[PDB]
Design a protein around this ligand. Structure first.
Ligand SMILES: NCCc1ccc(S(=O)(=O)F)cc1
Ligand SMILES: [Cl-]
Ligand SMILES: [Cl-]
Lengths: 445, 441
């Protein structure tokens, strides 16, 4: 009665709303209606149970991920076909992609540390295994540089489980695709990744399948192979631009009669797919890139805010215009699950205190940039001038890091302590005295 | 070619573009700067580095400050818009923020009841906080801002409460509607309302929030009030900065904008003496067409949380369409609990948020496996997300819910979940407040 969308291998032309029978990955059958198609893929909306044309009807099989540990090291299209000049994947298992396969997720909360090597993530809004932590951006800002840098650098310090990356790019140019391929190959980051690249001019249905192939590969490696898998998806806004024109959505208006029910829940079929996996040896973590579209009036898309429930990393033009990379502004950024990923045994015991203190000092110094403008630099107190200066040091030393610079959390906390020495010790009101004596550079060892 | 911070000066003598001038500061020192632009009555000066100081020496632009600002509707330059007399000042206060430092070195802290459950309940506004409403084109952020202006209060505070409502670049039809709403409801009697119209001079648009914040400072510090300042909309303020001294040069916003915004968002907090406070709720609207209105980086204003106005809920016909999941108030814990709201508040908030996030993920699961494949337990959480949106998020335009009202709606919809699944609620609160256990007193 208009349920789930599934994705089917196309073997003949089909018409809109054509009734079809589909053999699922688990061997059962479904009846449904065609919504749209590319050369090789059909999007079908399933009926529950029996019926919801009826004699001489198309029978098809679902589109599958060829799942194997040998996905690692390969660069594929959005449909899973090679782009790297290698042979097609030889599967251990053929899995449906819409999220129904495996039932992999545990009812356990996300928890341990993922070291991205980027101080403004690991330091102040830590990524934890099983989390969904979007990077929020806008045209012109280097969100894909950050995504690619995390793909090269990320690890799970101390874990007994192997680590893998799934990197899925949607709607990208040829030059972007060549650049991402080059990057993965030259750095050796490819050996632990599966890369799915969908181009702007590839079929829109292929773009819609892209994150499902990627999430299914991640779930397979996490659950069947006990891995912590980090899924980078770029750009969910480009996905949404294909979705709003696919199938039953075409020239229909959100909020109006004729807009199809599945458009309100499609994005949740992506964001639901993250978490610790059963057995607790592996996990699926997502870092989706959400770029602010500049065209809400002309191209209404489903609301992206459903993707934002466990925090956000905010890319700020102010910092970009100052010449700083990564231009992440930690103050509007948040990781709701950070405390589950930090402290003794995970990062270091002083982690929360240092993050809290850097955060508070930076927010105060940024407000003092306003006060300086209101009263003049020479009217600021000594103490306030220290905080004003601290916000510069924060931006120039802690936020700023090289594209190729992979900071351990120790590196990150040490830079944090060094800049914190600019503040008067009696002004560190978020840091327990135990930690000042043990870790502050004036008391250390 | 526009470098330093903007200071506003009373036009007392004719000035020229780029003229070098001194500005007299509230303590008798002077700063030096250069004329950037001017209207007939207000000069915009860019100040130089300098410090304390024959050429023009200008006076800062002043707010005519009196408790009799309350009940008045004024332009962005403070002139009457309500057919009343010009304000008779007890004090003339520099609007640039420099003659009086009312702020204490104290964190924001007690409760402001907006009467809107999706703020009070889950993302509480506290006194001294800056809590932006993040909106986008075609969403009802100004309805929400007006409803907060009508409803907000500080329950049990010994300090009286006031509102300052400042609207920038608005239409005549919007201005009439806001004036009508404040008049008819009586919300005007405790408010100072500053209305800048789209076609008023752009210089008055950038003075508008400075007039507003100076009025709030004056009431809060010199009259011991909690003042709530609602500023709508910082994107239109940014658009006016794209003007100052140009007829304009290229696409983006001026580089000094980020420091200029800080002169607005620094002006919030508890005031010295701790019997008053300035709280801000700025509306930050993303433009609907970035070709003609590029997207500004207003993230400098987002350091203590934000309230997210969401298209999904608006498309589903729910007012207020606030999505609690991406919303946050970083200072909420300072505003809630025994003696402020009610002891169970944090628990009920944590439980509703966890139950709604779970229910919303389960809408994704239904769209994968079909509704009939969901477990009976999962179905309760699915249904909970519907109850949360239809009973808790949804409320009338004029429905003013006490925090008690909000927490009781919360308990009623929480009864739909299995009691054993309430992992965020202390067994003591379940025994005392859960409708299945609570005793009639
Ligand atoms: N028209 C904007 C520039 C400008 C510059 C100077 C003045 S005046 O107040 O000195 F007559 C007025 C306007
Ligand atoms: Cl900007
Ligand atoms: Cl939507």
């Amino acid at each position: 009665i208009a349920g789930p969308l599934i994705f089917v291998e196309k073997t003949e032309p089909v018409g809109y709303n054509e009734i079809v029978n589909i053999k699922m990955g688990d061997g059962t059958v479904r009846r449904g209606q065609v919504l749209d198609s590319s050369a090789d893929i059909v999007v079908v909306q399933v009926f529950e149970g029996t019926g919801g044309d009826c004699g001489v009807i198309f029978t098809g099989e679902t589109l599958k991920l060829p799942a194997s540990v040998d996905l690692l090291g390969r660069i594929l299209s959005g449909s899973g076909e090679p782009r790297d000049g290698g042979p097609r994947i030889v599967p251990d298992q053929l899995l449906d992609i819409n999220g129904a396969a495996m039932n992999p997720y545990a009812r356990l909360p996300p928890k341990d540390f993922i070291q991205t090597g980027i101080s403004t993530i690991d330091g102040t809004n830590t990524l934890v295994r099983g989390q969904k932590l979007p990077i929020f951006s806008a045209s012109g800002l280097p969100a894909n540089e950050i995504a690619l840098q995390i793909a090269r650098q990320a690890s799970v310090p101390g874990s007994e489980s192997a680590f893998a990356v799934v990197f899925a790019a949607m709607g990208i140019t040829n030059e972007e695709a060549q650049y991402f391929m080059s990057d993965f190959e030259k750095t050796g980051a490819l050996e632990r990744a599966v890369v799915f690249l969908n181009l702007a001019d590839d079929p829109a249905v292929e773009r819609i399948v892209t994150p499902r192939m990627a999430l299914t590969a991640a779930e397979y490696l996490a659950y069947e192979h006990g891995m912590h898998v980090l899924v980078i998806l770029t750009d969910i806004t480009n996905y949404a631009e294909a979705l709003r024109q696919m199938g039953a959505a075409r020239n229909e208006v959100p909020g109006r009669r004729g807009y199809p029910g599945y458009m309100y829940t499609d994005l949740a079929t992506l964001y639901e797919r993250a978490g610790i996996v059963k057995g607790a040896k592996g996990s699926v973590t997502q870092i989706p890139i959400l770029s602010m579209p500049g065209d809400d009036i002309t191209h209404p898309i489903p609301d992206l805010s459903g993707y934002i429930t466990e925090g956000q990393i905010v890319v700020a033009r102010e910092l970009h215009r100052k010449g700083i990379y990564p231009p992440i502004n930690v103050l509007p950024s948040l990781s709701r699950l950070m405390n589950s990923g930090i402290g003794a045994g995970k990062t270091r015991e002083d982690h929360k205190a240092v993050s809290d203190q850097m955060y508070a000092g930076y927010a105060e110094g940024r407000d003092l940039r306003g006060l300086v403008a209101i009263v003049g630099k020479e009217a600021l107190s000594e103490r306030d001038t220290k905080f004003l200066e601290f916000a510069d040091l924060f931006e120039d030393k802690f936020v700023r890091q090289g594209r190729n610079e992979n900071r351990t959390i120790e590196d990150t906390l040490e830079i944090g302590w060094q800049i914190l020495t600019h503040l008067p010790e009696n002004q560190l009101g978020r840091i327990d005295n135990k930690y000042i004596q043990k870790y502050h550079p004036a008391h250390r060892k």
